[PDB]
Design an enzyme around this catalytic site. Structure first.
Site, mmCIF file in Angstrom:
data_model
loop_
_atom_site.group_PDB
_atom_site.id
_atom_site.type_symbol
_atom_site.label_atom_id
_atom_site.label_comp_id
_atom_site.label_asym_id
_atom_site.label_seq_id
_atom_site.Cartn_x
_atom_site.Cartn_y
_atom_site.Cartn_z
ATOM 1 N N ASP A 208 0.823 -1.208 0.000
ATOM 2 C CA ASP A 208 0.000 0.000 0.000
ATOM 3 C C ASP A 208 0.859 1.260 0.000
ATOM 4 O OD1 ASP A 208 -2.463 -1.281 -0.153
ATOM 5 O OD2 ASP A 208 -2.616 -1.495 2.023
ATOM 6 N N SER A 209 1.908 1.250 -0.811
ATOM 7 C CA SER A 209 2.729 2.423 -1.044
ATOM 8 C C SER A 209 2.585 2.836 -2.500
ATOM 9 C CB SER A 209 4.197 2.152 -0.704
ATOM 10 O OG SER A 209 4.900 3.360 -0.492
#
Ligand SMILES: [Mg+2]
Ligand SMILES: [Zn+2]
Ligand SMILES: [Zn+2]
Ligand SMILES: [Zn+2]
Lengths: 258, 49, 192, 46, 52, 427, 49, 34, 67, 115, 240
Positions: free
Chosen positions: F156-157
């Site tokens: 989730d970057s």
RNA sequence: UGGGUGGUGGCC
């Protein structure tokens, strides 16, 4: 064991873009040229702003940021100016920088469009791109608001900031038909033909070539107007060759000192 | 006189009532402000239902 | 270090094209859903004529719900299996599921085939109103679409009632997440 | 020491001394904004 | 110390032409807070020039 | 049709919603009355003659999508997302920065965030027309490519384009207001605004007072930094310093300083300090579908992948964020953004429309020379080689949250201490 | 708050067109804070004479 | 007359009129005025 | 708040097309034709004009702090 | 705050050698050329040219971390051919290629500008 | 009352005895960094330049410590305090006289945190033993904690805005106690269920499944490019 | 001048 002999063909040339083709070259060299187009092509842009009065509704840093992105015509000066980190002058001299002045006040009732034509420079060879279709808008002023500032333009390339990038959009593409199968289509028939496709409308892709290499690298280099589109390519090749020469000099020095 | 009642913005008894958007702009209050909140010691307070 | 640099050559992605059936599995899914609706209607009809033998150890309502849930679960599983069979070898959901990196086959089934049946407290949507679940329905309706069976898929979009029932089903997860944290920490604190 | 200020509404340059009630010499408006500084400000256009 | 509390202009180097105010200084170098960025850096006193 | 025709002329005619209520066409219905009505979801579908389901309708919904709140009515294609994603988007939709009010330059608010270049969504819902979202937007349409590029955007970057950020992408400015008034604790305790000196002032910190002028108030346009004097204030006993300091790690610029009087007639002043926040690493960005993430690395333009034409993604998000959360609305929005940009018209993503589906958008995209599923052939940004897998890429509305990393970094090494129990303070 | 009861927190059937089914805090106050739907209106009351 | 299959256009006209007449915070203003 | 000088993605100059775009819109021109009448080919540049909202005009209504 | 200055990508500071050579010990006739303040623009072409030499048995480059500007090029050649001379021959070949390319491009531009 | 002062949570025993607030701590957002060994943590310069570690002067390191003391507190790889063996400490932020910069053998130098230091790195919901591992520091430019991805699974970190604390042991014995007991590589196998807690995840897992298929073929150029990334490679190219 | 109270929010 030796570099092969590339050839160049130009298919379209305007004052906004150049569309050429390069034959007989490794893919890495072509990609590196494409890369130097984007990053390492020196250009002139303003990089130092002092604001005296700003009654507009946009804060000073926003004005400075918008100013920095204005393209400046630097065709014969970019190779004559020295990088400010290299010039031995005190403060700023015409040999390494250009001075800009802006002074607009709105006393009339209607709004006043502060455009790039209000930027006045002391170097006739370096002016924003409005030499001869409106101008770049900077702010809008209401009655009673004024904006006076002083700016300096210097030399840089895109590897440092994106305001020194000379190219708007660089298109690069090899092997328009998927002959080498670098990309693998799950359903080939769903894919539109490429612009440079030498393929009849029936088949979707060329038959597989077991022993082939990337050749015939198509380009379309479009300038943002600051440099003539061919000057971008020439400066890119010169800069890459100079970088290689400097690396070779340092390498020889290190080798003869081990 | 009995006391002061805080007034909720854009009500019937608020000064920002019935004014044209031009008047609101001339008074440095944008016409998009919904109102419906009290101002207590300069802080905008809202009454949660 | 090695794999992240070979991935630059290979590449990996996901998109709309990876969530599409071949327009022939869609017909199969539609037929399965139609058959499930027909079967639940038949069970309801046999129920209102008192021709339903109660299941051993279950009341009449309990066995009715048992057959209904069995039919709906069979429909969901069959549609999901058909969706899995439909996927190609170049699909990205399949690649990321078979490797165990993210997701599971039920997610593929819900994206492609059918969302499924919603529940609260392990049961179908309760009669929040008087003898019905929403004002848009009719009194004493125990059909599939009136008690929270989401017929569509995430790709095909949800109808209003199915959307609301899905929101109900989702709220339970948030509530459970809220309470589980509050309990487990205290348990471990006392243990230690 | 003069400490020139600007009125909130009429924007008339008026002077007020220390320990003096804040008020525009005309229009009696009680909001004053300080004028911009005189020392140099330099912004890089990055 | 004279240098403390002075508006200074960097005379050479990559930071040539920038401005700031000296916070702390020694007999060799000094610390200048840049007016244009949210950072304080250390620069040599020889490359410095007091302005105003 | 007569009612609609009169409504369409409501600036000429005085015919309004009240006149519609008067003619007995609509009727307010509370919950208890709702308990007994028969509701039709839509007239042109649920009222035609078929095998009679109920055939006794007493009301009809105006539009089904009208059941969502203010925040959840800006989500495009919300009926295509998993349920908790809509809730998360509603939660994070109140933390996206934007022009929070038109006249934001006059108000002396505390902690004001405003974005340089807000934009309206390329794909909107019909509901956000009445929220005035197209006048005070919060977010920027960005070319987003869903691909694993370098492994810097995995959990989730996201990866951002350094050149785009240099061009002002997602740049934002951050205001902060200070307040200080002089009150009389007693005839022997009187506070004044006055520049302290090294001669007579006893209690003092290591912050010199050269920034402020003789009035004791720092003029606008003066660079400030952490632990720097702002309002030179002394007290009488003799003279001790009670001046306020700009809090540590701010390093802004004094925007404007206003001076007035309170009810008691004391001198009063509010000082606003502005700071520009470039979207560096660690900042939080989120889609409109609950896809929050933090920047992982910023590559320059020549490092990002590109298409046949020189289009480079602004943000790259991992493919592994999609399957678990099943935010197919995100994919559909990205697909229709391409159609909206090429066709030149703003798409519509009203929740329950039934006139828009994947096939229609795919055909419309194919009518412009792109792959019908929105995929594209990208070239590797370093070696220039093709990528064996076609990447999904298109415009998408992202919004930059207010949880900046520079507001959260903190470290300590033998700092201050409490009084009761001699332990380090908190905060 | 801090109550293990889930009935006050669940999404009741009656919240159709009156309260947003999606918007709610996810902290310790999940389900106890609600926001009106777009068309919802609160009655103001009148004398029943 | 009946509005067939052009109801999509007419459905949002009433919404626009409703939000033109009653604002987004009409409940607060009504309650305080009362 | 005001039209960006350069397109974010590619770097094309777009800050001078806003007034021309509005002028074309105040005619028979549609957005799909106004955009490519201005020479905006890549959709990255198209969205820059297409989805930009101009708040500077509203801001100009407030009386300036000075005179 | 912790943002590095923009010119750290391409500027050498005091006491930073542009290129450093270390002899690899695992296998004979192997060296590690560590070049400071460079990126793929240069390493990619150097490696690609090195692969055309038939006396080279290994040639690759890597960037240890994208937040640090330096690349390592590893070369292994046959016993009768040092890696250093292979590297310098690759440099000369690249320079000759670029010179020829720019000359032919100038010729093509002149041809196009006058029909 | 007195009972309230130590009754329950935030009281004496539970708020100031079994839990305290400590010096030498840091906290920042976490972002991925696949180029760090699973026992490394990337700290920013501002945090590194603020947290010190006392070091004993010794004839084997007196020169380097002298140079660091010369650098001072402004330049990063410097010191902050110098402590005489009698207990007195000399500050370094207030331009001290050159006489005090002289240091003897038994002195202490409060130097900044350089590369290779040992830290404790935990995530606040500290459930099990594998949430409090020790890492080795590597300083990196931007302001964020960077850690390898195979280590996220124990910590249950997500890079979606999470934050983690960093504790720096302040003594040699504590450093050796951390290094020999709670390094990340020593915690691969949990005693809870005798199985690994760290595995290959995300893009690495997907691409290694795609990589080891029967029909993945690589030319020599890509093979050399890949072998350039093996740290344990022996420099021999296998027969194709 | 510090203590106290409440609210909002972030990550699980
Ligand atoms: Mg998280
Ligand atoms: Zn000069
Ligand atoms: Zn006045
Ligand atoms: Zn563009």
């Amino acid at each position: 064991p030796y570099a092969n002999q590339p050839t160049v063909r130009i298919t379209e040339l305007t004052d906004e873009n150049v569309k050429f083709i390069i034959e007989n070259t490794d893919l890495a060299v072509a990609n590196s040229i494409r890369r130097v187009f984007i990053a390492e092509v020196p250009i002139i842009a303003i990089d130092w702003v002092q604001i005296d009065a700003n009654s507009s509704v946009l804060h000073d840093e926003f004005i400075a940021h918008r100013l920095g992105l204005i393209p400046l015509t630097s065709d014969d000066i970019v190779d004559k100016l020295q990088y400010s980190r290299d010039c031995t002058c005190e403060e700023f001299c015409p040999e390494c920088s250009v001075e800009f002045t802006l002074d607009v006040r709105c006393n009339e009732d209607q709004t006043r469009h502060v455009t790039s034509r209000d930027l006045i420079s002391n170097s006739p060879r370096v002016i924003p791109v409005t030499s001869r279709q409106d101008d770049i808008l900077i702010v809008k002023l209401r009655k009673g608001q004024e904006l006076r500032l002083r700016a300096y333009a210097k030399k840089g390339f895109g590897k440092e900031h994106a305001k020194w990038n000379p190219t708007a959009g660089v298109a690069f593409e090899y092997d328009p038909d998927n002959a080498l199968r670098h990309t693998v289509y799950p359903k080939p028939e769903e894919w539109p033909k490429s612009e440079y496709s030498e393929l009849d409308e029936d088949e979707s892709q060329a038959p597989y070539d077991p022993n082939g290499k990337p050749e015939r690298f198509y380009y379309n280099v479009e300038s943002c107007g600051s440099l003539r589109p061919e000057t971008i390519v020439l400066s890119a090749l010169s800069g890459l060759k100079k970088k290689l020469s400097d690396l070779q000099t340092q390498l020889s020095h290190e080798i003869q000192s081990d | 006189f009995i006391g002061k009642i805080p007034i909720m913005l854009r009500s019937t008894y608020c000064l920002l009532n019935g004014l044209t958007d031009r008047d609101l702009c001339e008074l440095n209050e944008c016409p998009l402000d919904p109102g419906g909140y009290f101002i207590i010691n300069g802080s905008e307070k809202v009454l949660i239902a | 270090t090695v794999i992240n640099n070979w991935l630059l050559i290979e590449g990996h992605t996901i998109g709309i094209g990876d969530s599409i059936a071949d327009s022939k599995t869609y017909q199969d899914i539609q037929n399965t859903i139609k058959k499930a609706k027909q079967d639940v209607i038949e069970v309801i009809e046999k129920a209102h004529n008192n021709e339903l033998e109660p299941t051993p150890g279950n009341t009449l309502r309990q066995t009715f719900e048992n057959q209904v849930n069995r039919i709906l679960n069979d429909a969901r599983d069959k549609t999901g299996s058909s969706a899995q069979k439909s996927l190609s070898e170049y699909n990205n959901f399949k690649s990321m599921v078979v490797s165990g990196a993210k997701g599971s086959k039920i997610n593929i089934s819900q994206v492609i085939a059918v969302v499924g049946q919603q529940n609260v407290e392990g049961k179908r949507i309760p009669f929040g109103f008087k003898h019905r679940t929403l004002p848009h329905f009719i009194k004493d309706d125990y059909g599939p679409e009136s008690r929270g069976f989401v017929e569509n898929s995430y790709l095909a979009g949800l109808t209003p009632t199915e959307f609301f029932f899905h929101a109900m089903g989702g709220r339970e997860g948030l509530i459970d997440t809220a309470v589980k944290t509050a309990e487990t920490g205290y348990i471990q604190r006392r243990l230690i | 020491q003069p400490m020139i200020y600007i009125c909130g509404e009429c924007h008339t340059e008026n002077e007020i001394k220390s320990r003096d009630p804040i008020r525009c010499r005309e229009c009696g408006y009680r909001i004053m904004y300080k004028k911009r500084t005189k020392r140099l400000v330099v912004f890089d256009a990055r | 110390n004279e240098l403390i509390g002075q508006t200074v202009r960097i005379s050479q180097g990559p930071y040539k032409g920038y401005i700031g105010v000296v916070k702390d200084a020694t007999e060799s170098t000094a610390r200048v807070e840049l007016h244009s960025t949210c950072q304080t850096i250390s620069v040599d006193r020889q490359r410095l020039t007091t302005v105003g | 049709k007569r009612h609609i025709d009169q409504l369409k002329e409501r600036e000429y005619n005085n015919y309004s919603w009240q006149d519609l209520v008067a003619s007995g066409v609509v009727e307010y219905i509370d919950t208890l009355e709702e308990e007994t009505v028969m509701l039709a979801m839509t007239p042109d579908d649920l009222q035609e003659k078929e095998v009679a389901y109920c055939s006794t309708y007493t009301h009809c919904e105006i539009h089904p999508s009208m059941i969502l709140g203010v925040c959840a009515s800006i989500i495009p294609f919300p009926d295509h997302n998993q349920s908790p994603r809509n809730t998360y988007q509603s939660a994070m939709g109140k933390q996206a920065m934007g022009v929070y009010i038109t006249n934001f330059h006059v108000r002396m608010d505390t902690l004001a965030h405003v974005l340089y270049y807000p934009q309206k969504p390329l794909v909107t819902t019909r509901s956000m027309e009445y929220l005035r979202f197209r006048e005070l937007p919060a977010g920027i349409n960005s070319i987003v490519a869903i691909a694993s590029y370098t492994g810097y955007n995995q959990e989730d970057s996201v990866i951002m384009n350094r050149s785009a950020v240099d061009r002002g992408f997602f740049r934002s400015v951050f205001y902060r207001s200070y307040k200080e008034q002089e009150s009389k604790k007693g005839f022997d305790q009187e506070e004044v605004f006055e520049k302290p000196t090294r001669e007579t002032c006893q209690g003092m910190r290591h912050a010199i007072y050269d920034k402020l002028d003789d009035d004791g108030l720092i003029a606008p346009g003066v660079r400030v930094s952490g632990d720097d004097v702002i309002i030179g204030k002394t007290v009488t006993l003799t003279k001790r310093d009670c001046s306020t300091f700009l809090r540590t790690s701010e390093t802004g610029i004094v925007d404007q300083v206003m001076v007035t009087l309170n009810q008691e007639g004391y001198k009063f002043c509010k000082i606003r300090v502005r700071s520009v926040r470039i979207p560096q690493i660690g900042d939080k960005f989120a889609s409109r579908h609950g896809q929050k993430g933090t920047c992982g690395i910023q590559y320059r333009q020549e490092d990002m992948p590109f298409t046949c034409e020189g289009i480079t993604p602004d943000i790259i998000i991992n493919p592994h964020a999609i399957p678990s959360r099943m935010t197919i609305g995100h994919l559909i929005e990205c697909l229709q953004g391409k159609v909206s940009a090429n066709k030149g018209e703003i798409g519509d993503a009203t929740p329950f429309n039934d006139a828009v589906n994947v096939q229609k958008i795919s055909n419309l995209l194919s009518d412009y020379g792109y792959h019908l599923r929105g995929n594209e052939v990208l070239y590797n940004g370093f070696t220039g080689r093709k990528i064996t897998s076609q990447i999904f890429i298109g415009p998408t509305y992202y919004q930059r949250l207010k949880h900046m990393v520079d507001d959260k970094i903190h470290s300590r090494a033998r700092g201050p201490i409490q009084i009761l129990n001699r332990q380090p303070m908190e905060g | 708050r801090d109550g293990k009861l889930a009935k006050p927190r669940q999404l009741h059937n009656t919240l159709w067109g009156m309260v947003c089914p999606a918007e709610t805090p996810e902290g310790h106050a999940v389900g106890l804070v609600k926001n009106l739907a777009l068309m919802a209106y609160i009655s103001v009351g009148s004398q029943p004479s | 007359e009946i509005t067939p299959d052009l109801w999509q256009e007419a459905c949002w006209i009433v919404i626009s009129s409703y939000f033109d007449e009653k604002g987004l915070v009409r409940q607060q203003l009504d309650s305080f005025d009362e | 708040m005001i039209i960006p000088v350069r397109c974010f993605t590619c770097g094309k100059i777009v800050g001078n097309k806003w007034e021309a775009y509005l002028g074309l819109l105040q005619a028979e021109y549609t957005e799909g034709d106004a955009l490519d009448a201005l020479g905006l080919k890549r959709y990255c540049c198209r969205r820059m004009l297409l989805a930009h909202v101009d708040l500077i005009e509203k801001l100009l209504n407030y009386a300036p702090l000075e005179k | 705050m912790n943002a590095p200055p923009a010119f750290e990508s391409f500027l050498l500071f005091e006491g930073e050698k542009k290129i450093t050579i270390n002899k690899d010990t695992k296998v004979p006739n192997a060296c590690l050329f560590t070049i400071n303040k460079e990126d793929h623009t240069l390493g990619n072409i150097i490696k690609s040219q090195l692969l055309k030499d038939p006396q080279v048995l290994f040639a690759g480059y890597k960037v240890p971390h994208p937040l640090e500007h330096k690349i390592i090029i590893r070369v292994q050649t046959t016993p009768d051919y040092s890696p250093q001379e292979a590297f310098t021959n690759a440099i000369t070949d690249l320079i000759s290629e670029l010179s020829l390319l720019e000359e032919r491009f100038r010729v093509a531009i002149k041809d196009k500008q006058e029909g | 009352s007195l009972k309230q002062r130590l009754k329950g949570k935030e009281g004496r025993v539970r708020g100031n005895l079994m839990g305290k607030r400590v010096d030498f701590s840091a906290r920042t957002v976490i972002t991925p960094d696949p180029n760090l060994s699973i026992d490394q943590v990337g700290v920013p310069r501002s945090i590194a330049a603020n947290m010190t570690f006392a070091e004993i002067v010794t004839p084997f390191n007196i020169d380097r410590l002298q140079e660091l003391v010369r650098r001072g507190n402004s330049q990063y790889p410097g010191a902050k305090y110098i402590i005489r063996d009698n207990g007195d400490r000399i500050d370094l932020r207030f331009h001290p006289k050159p006489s005090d910069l002289h240091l003897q053998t038994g002195y202490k130098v409060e130097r900044h945190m350089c590369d290779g230091d040992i830290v404790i790195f935990n995530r606040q919901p500290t459930l099990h033993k594998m949430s409090m591992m020790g890492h080795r520091v590597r300083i990196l430019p931007w302001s964020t904690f960077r850690l390898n991805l195979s280590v996220t699974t124990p910590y249950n970190a997500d890079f979606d805005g999470d934050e983690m604390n960093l504790h720096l042991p302040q003594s040699l014995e504590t450093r050796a106690e951390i290094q020999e007991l709670a390094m990340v590589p020593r915690m691969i196998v949990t005693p809870q269920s005798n199985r690994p807690v760290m595995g290959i995840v995300q893009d690495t897992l997907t691409a290694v499944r795609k990589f080891t298929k029967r029909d993945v073929f690589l030319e020599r150029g890509e093979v050399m490019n890949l072998l350039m990334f093996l740290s344990t490679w022996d420099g021999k190219v296998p027969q194709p």
